Symmetry: none
Subunit: 83 residues, 12 copies
């Protein structure tokens, strides 16, 4: 949801497990070509920026799915960002 | 159809997967030169604007093909735009 | 042959072993510069699109060579595409 | 079959014996270069992701072979995923 | 503020972390299209010049935000430029 | 409204996001030919002058629409000009 | 020779490796400024049209040199054109 | 806590009991995939660098857990770093 | 000084670092609009001709500044022209 | 200091333990994103070139820190370069 | 010297170690911006063409330096070209 | 010699001992940076392709040395390729 737009820079600079999120979002929110495009970036911030480049086309449901995956993978990061 | 005409600005500013649409429209609606010209644009909004630059010569069938390609690629974007 | 033009989008989106095709087509259909240009692409669809960008100059024989390389590499993909 | 596409994330995150599956799929579905490429990944999830990167070129028969190999190797994993 | 105007050439030729500044300015001073336009430049000086091309529309507050982001990112560069 | 006529020179010399304004005014205030004519103009001040060349045929409503688009795109410029 | 004048449209629409031809013609037929002007075009047909714009000043020898470069680069394209 | 950030280089170059720390942090701070990724490094400094690569996503509690595990495992190293 | 008027054609045909000179001359002798106009040219000779298009309004001091910038950027060209 | 600018090529071609220097410069001279970007390069010369890619933003103090790290790591290399 | 001018096409198409030449020419013949611009090209021929684009400003000394660097790096290539 | 160009694909796909060839070609034909770049590839075909990427700069003597090394290491492979 609006959480990923409000904390865009922090999520880009602090998310460390991107492959799990990519697997969670594969097929339903991300196409296979976008999946490879994100996986081709050298560093984690580069992968996060490539993933965020696809967000303008997303609706509320896709952002909700991403935030749910974030809670499942990094609960502590989401808790820190909310606090 | 008229959908891509009434939502021109939103489609320009929110479509993120342009290469798939170009491949879908290649040969049937876009010539090779137009395909290369669209592919040569720097950013996604520039690519999508270059794509609409060819729309005045399209009939209802070409617009329907583009709408079908958008539905297959980004169902959520089309659902959000309709809503 | 006409097969690679009829199934251009599917070949772009589904070919997974591009290096073998590049080695097969090197020297006789592809120059060294075009070879390096194709290998420079990040993802498999990007490599396939770069390879297809050289197809306008190809005659029937070059397309036949590409189809033969595809049959040797991915027999199952060609069989699925034909049916 | 469609089983490996329905449970892609779970199969990536839970398959522990990848070398046996690579032996089962060698030659028939996997080329030697793809064999080496998958075998060179550091971790089991990395190996599974690299193997799944070749799935877009597969037809139903190759996926059936992979599912049969999974049933022979990890019957319990397949039963758990089905349940 | 006037700091980036009196040190335009030095900032163009010496700023090395442009993505961090872009992330800091995203959503408040730079639009998404401008973000992609700056991000698409080949070299760091090109990115800096593209970013500076948008400065005529900026007020004092936007320039202050850019200066504060620079101070967060490169304290040493700002200290050297002031000295 | 009269705002764009009071600050014509400043708007010409300081507006940096012209494509967004063109998309906002497309169809409603700007014809397709006028859109291409503005878009083919090389530099941003020159594009703004080309766009302003169509203002003599505008009523209060079109000027208000342009002002609203400017407020949505670059607010800081708007309060800078008002102040 | 007369070959490039007879097949001007096909050469414009089908030549894919313009950089090699430019390097072959550099210094002897093309000046540095013309070389840079041709290299600055977006797409291959645009590059070919820009190069052909210099042909009115060429004699038979320059056209023969261009034909020899084409034969060395893409023999199959020449054979297709003659056939 | 801030201890592991203050002594990052010393901890990377001096920690010799990494598998025990991985066991301590498994499940609650480290995912299974991250555990495998850390265990795949050849040398102890490489393992420590891979482990520290995940610290940007950690909050204060995770760093406290890591410090407590370090105190349990190698108290002499911690007291030496304090002095 | 008179150096750039004596070697106008050679400077047009041989200067390859135009952006550095533009940055050096920005604000002091070049306005923003002229800066964008010069950067909008396709090739280096075209950019340098656009730069000389503004020289009739320059006095000795501006030409001296341009010569000093040229000496700082590309000295070897300066001694080559003087010799 | 000026030492790393005087011996840039030799330092690029002869430094063998880039990781130790990166750990020494982490945080105070290098950000985390730049740290990952440097560690993502294939070979030691590539890593060291990526490291010098950030040097234009450095002041004298950062270069002094790098020289001190080099002295601590490879005293023989520094002694040979000075001699 | 004139060697790189009479063998321009062969040097563009056959030079394989470009980074070493860039390091050799950095700081005395090439500026930092030109260095980054050359390093940003995808393939070796593209890098060589970008490097040659700066040659019009070079005098005999810079070309001699480039030839000396080529002899130090690839003696066999220079020997083959001379023969 | 011409043997390594006639059997490029077979040599890429069938050579299994690459470190021995790299050591044989080290210093004489391969620089240290090229040695590291080739050695950093994941799989044997990748290493062979990276090594072949440097072939365009080689003369007949370098290819003769490579063929001699291949004969010394894999006599059976060379004998099979001859027939």
């Amino acid at each position: 949801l609006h959480f990923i737009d409000q904390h865009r820079a922090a999520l880009i600079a602090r998310v460390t497990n991107v492959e799990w999120l990519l697997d969670a979002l594969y097929g339903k929110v991300l196409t296979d070509e976008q999946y490879q495009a994100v996986r081709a970036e050298p560093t984690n911030p580069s992968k996060m920026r490539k993933l965020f480049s696809f967000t303008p086309a997303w609706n509320w449901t896709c952002k909700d799915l991403l935030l749910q995956a974030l809670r499942e993978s990094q609960s502590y990061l989401v808790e820190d960002l909310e606090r």
